[PDB]
Homo-oligomer: A and B are copies of this chain.
């Protein structure tokens, strides 16, 4: 059998077979990858033929020459899709970022005095105005925002939190596991479904340095359920002289009812003007900006957090920083519709159907396509609004030759790739998340798969 492997050609040989076919570098890489897959499949004795080799090597090349990370047409109708890269960016923003990165900038440089300056200084001016807090700060992500406030104000001392708010958001984030590593001592009060104020006030003592509440962003509880009002926690804190820290998570920058969507989702300005001492949240969620941990609250506290030697390991990069400023600039100018996440959720019901049938008009001709437009109620928010359920128009399709399952599979392999919902062997396309310029790309993808 040491003859069923001697066969396999030489990398020198295959690079020849692709003279100008493909770059020499990409050829050798695909040959190696392929050369190893045949040595093992032959060593375990699972291959008797090698003809697949030639065809495969070229497939690796065609594959290995395209970027891993690629824009993806989201048809699921979930605005904050943790998996697809959360909040996408308006071009306005992406260009301001493009420019600052193109060359040098006054990142850590104050042009006034001609000496180094804090990079966190450019933005904070925007934050304190929009929220109303005394001072602000920003780090890598909210995950770290939590960890920093804990290690800053409660290392070695106790922090009270409701047993119903010890969440697991994401694959590796868990309030209980992080806070541990945070150095803070965890004192869990109340019970899963219910927690009164007595529960909080009961566990206070000499060690209690913090009263923390987390917002159940990626889940919710119904049935017999009780929660401790925010006004009450503030009252409790100012009674014993204990600080209050709210991890909003959603990072909703403004009141949401002002846009027609009626929900209780909390927001910075409102929670700050409520009496909370500190508040944090992700920027790539309900804020609609790049990944960023945002913290706002009392000056005395912000100063304490900034000075922590760990803040330097969380300090934001040049990209998200600038990109954050232009997203913040848009918020001051009330340019709401310019921020993707905002526009997608506040879209006119009329507006949705309008795009639902403009796509159906582009697929009537494609062979074997059963096209219909259905009005369905989905839950837009993926990583920030769990309970929200809003109506949206899906253009459900079905081909006679291929099945809905196999259909989603090839669409995710397309270039560009398309990810969509599946419900009872009927592929669905939520228009809540689909951009206009994709409609033309949707039709050309479908016609290249069912006609090839």
**Chain A residues packing against B (C-beta within 8 Å):** 23, 25, 67-74, 81-86, 88-89, 91, 94-109, 111, 114, 116-117, 121-123, 125, 140-141, 143-144, 146-148, 151, 163-178, 180-181, 188, 190-194, 216, 218-226, 284, 290-293, 308-323, 325-326, 329, 332-334, 340, 386-387, 408-409, 412-413, 417, 419, 433, 435
Contacts and interface: CB of A to CB of B under 8 A. Distances in A.
Given A91-B102, A114-B412, A317-B320, 16 more contacts: A67-B326, A84-B109, A85-B105, A85-B106, A114-B408, A140-B316, A148-B313, A151-B181, A167-B193, A174-B191, A192-B192, A192-B219, A218-B224, A220-B223, A319-B319, A319-B323
B181 A165 contact: no
A442 to B, nearest CB: 13
Copies of this protein chain in the complex: 3
Contact of A104 (B85, B191, B325): B85
Contact of A164 (B82, B123, B192, B319): B192
Given A174-B309, A309-B181, A413 B69 contact: no
B103 A94 contact: no
A412 B111 contact: yes
A445 to B, nearest CB: 14
A188 B186 CA distance: 13
Nearest to A324: B69
A72 to B, nearest CB: 5
A95 to B, nearest CB: 8
Contacts of A224: 168-169, 218-219
A198 to B, nearest CB: 12
Contacts of A114: 408-409, 412, 419
Given A168-B191, A220-B223, A223-B218, A88 B101 contact: yes
A163 B147 contact: no
Nearest to A178: B309
Nearest to A414: B111
Contacts of A292: 317
B151 A163 contact: no
B100 A71 contact: yes
A31 to B, nearest CB: 14
Question: Max chain B CB contacts within 10 Å: which of A69, A73, A143, A433?
Answer: A69
Contacts of A435: 103
Given A69-B321, A83-B116, A125-B68, A192 B173 contact: no
B97 A319 contact: yes
Nearest to A308: B181
A409 to B, nearest CB: 7
Contacts of A325: 67-69
Contact of A314 (B82, B144, B221): B144
Nearest to A317: B291
Given A68-B325, A99-B71, A218-B193, A290 B318 contact: yes
Contacts of A140: 140, 144, 313-317
Question: Max chain B CB contacts within 10 Å: which of A173, A291, A292?
Answer: A291
Given A102-B91, A178-B309, A315 B69 contact: no
B334 A319 contact: no
A72 B105 contact: yes
Contacts of A146: 313
A432 to B, nearest CB: 12
Contact of A175 (B67, B101, B191, B419): B191
A117 to B, nearest CB: 8
Contacts of A69: 100, 105-107, 122, 321-322, 325
B386 A310 contact: no
Nearest to A126: B68
A312 B178 contact: yes
Contacts of A68: 106, 121-123, 125, 325
